[PDB]
Design a protein around this ligand. Structure first.
Ligand SMILES: NCCOP(=O)(O)OC[C@H](O)CO
Ligand SMILES: [Ca+2]
Ligand SMILES: [Ca+2]
Ligand SMILES: [Ca+2]
Ligand SMILES: [Ca+2]
Ligand SMILES: [Ca+2]
Ligand SMILES: [Ca+2]
Ligand SMILES: [Ca+2]
Ligand SMILES: [Ca+2]
Ligand SMILES: [Ca+2]
Ligand SMILES: [Ca+2]
Length: 318
């Protein structure tokens, strides 16, 4: 049911492609067009094979070259696209965590939308790539129930979708109800446990009966009960349980809606998801927002960057 826009190129030849890329750069100038057209049409496995052949034919490192040539937002996107799939989340996470500050958004966005199977592979790589443990750095940078909700999620231990038990569904909607609305203050620790560990098929059933029992949708109670980065994170978890596609479509929308563009988010979501589920994110973008994603990107972005982005996106109207 899920599908991305970027696929493996039929009739690929690593060796052909590296000669175009060498020719696209050699000497004065840079043909940003031959690059952008080649790269947005090869799967990311295929960009790594193209980076292999470039170094065996020329003894040059394709990413460092491209980094010396290109600039600005375009460099940023092409560099994100040469990043191997199994390392790009690990990367966005390490660079969010490092330095004094920490960018909660990236942390929230990736740890909440990624499945368990994904979160495992991200800890694996992060460790073999940076020689730190992820959990430790997250804890090193955060505080409170936000840190704690992120550590629950980092354990990648959510329950399996199993046959559903109505009794447990009513049990769980009633405890949330008693942990928030019906409580002076809040019992955030019950929200972290039931939201952070129960199966996805089961909490979607909890979110409906809770609306029956309380007259509130769980997002609304989260708004009323909490503030800060924990409000954010619980909202991000609820929306990913309901739909990761729609949560990500919605994360792209608020990147482009405003007075500018959250470029870093625009890039990170299109590249990360290009091969996983950007076709579906595009469906939910339209369904929920009347604008199509192509369009939104077409009025927000200029340059080589825009063309690259739209090529990755595909389907206008879709
Ligand atoms: N619906 C209003 C929720 O207020 P609540 O978070 O449930 O209690 C306030 C806390 O004890 C303030 O210091
Ligand atoms: Ca050049
Ligand atoms: Ca140029
Ligand atoms: Ca540069
Ligand atoms: Ca930090
Ligand atoms: Ca911060
Ligand atoms: Ca800490
Ligand atoms: Ca309360
Ligand atoms: Ca509390
Ligand atoms: Ca709030
Ligand atoms: Ca805008």
């Amino acid at each position: 049911a899920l599908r991305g826009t970027v696929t493996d190129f039929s009739g690929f030849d690593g060796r052909a492609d590296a000669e175009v890329l060498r020719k696209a750069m050699k000497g004065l100038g840079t043909d940003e067009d031959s690059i952008l057209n080649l790269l947005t049409a090869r799967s990311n496995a295929q960009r790594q094979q193209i980076a292999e052949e470039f170094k065996t034919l020329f003894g040059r490192d394709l990413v460092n070259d491209m980094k010396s040539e290109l600039t600005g937002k375009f460099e940023k996107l092409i560099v994100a696209l040469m990043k191997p799939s199994r390392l790009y989340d690990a990367y966005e996470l390490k660079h969010a965590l490092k330095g004094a500050g920490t960018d909660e958004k990236v942390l929230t966005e990736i740890i909440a939308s990624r499945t368990p199977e994904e979160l495992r592979a991200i800890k694996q790589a992060y460790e073999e790539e940076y020689g730190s443990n992820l959990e430790d750095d997250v804890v090193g940078d955060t505080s409170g129930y936000y840190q704690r909700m992120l550590v629950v999620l980092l354990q990648a231990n959510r329950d399996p979708d199993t046959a559903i038990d109505d009794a447990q569904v009513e049990l769980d909607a009633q405890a949330l109800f008693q942990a928030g609305e019906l409580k002076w203050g809040t019992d955030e620790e019950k929200f972290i446990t039931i939201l952070g560990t129960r199966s996805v098929s089961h909490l979607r059933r909890v979110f409906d009966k809770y609306m029956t029992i309380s007259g509130f949708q769980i997002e609304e109670t989260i708004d009323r009960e909490t503030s800060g980065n924990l409000e954010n994170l619980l909202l991000a978890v609820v929306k990913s349980i309901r739909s990761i596609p729609a949560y990500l479509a919605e994360t792209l929308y608020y990147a482009m809606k405003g007075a500018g563009t959250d470029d870093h988010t625009l890039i990170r979501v299109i590249v990360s998801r290009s091969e996983i589920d950007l076709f579906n994110i595009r469906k939910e973008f339209r369904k929920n927002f009347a604008t199509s994603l192509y369009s939104m990107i077409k009025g927000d972005t200029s340059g080589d960057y825009k063309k690259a982005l739209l090529l990755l996106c595909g389907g206008e109207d879709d």
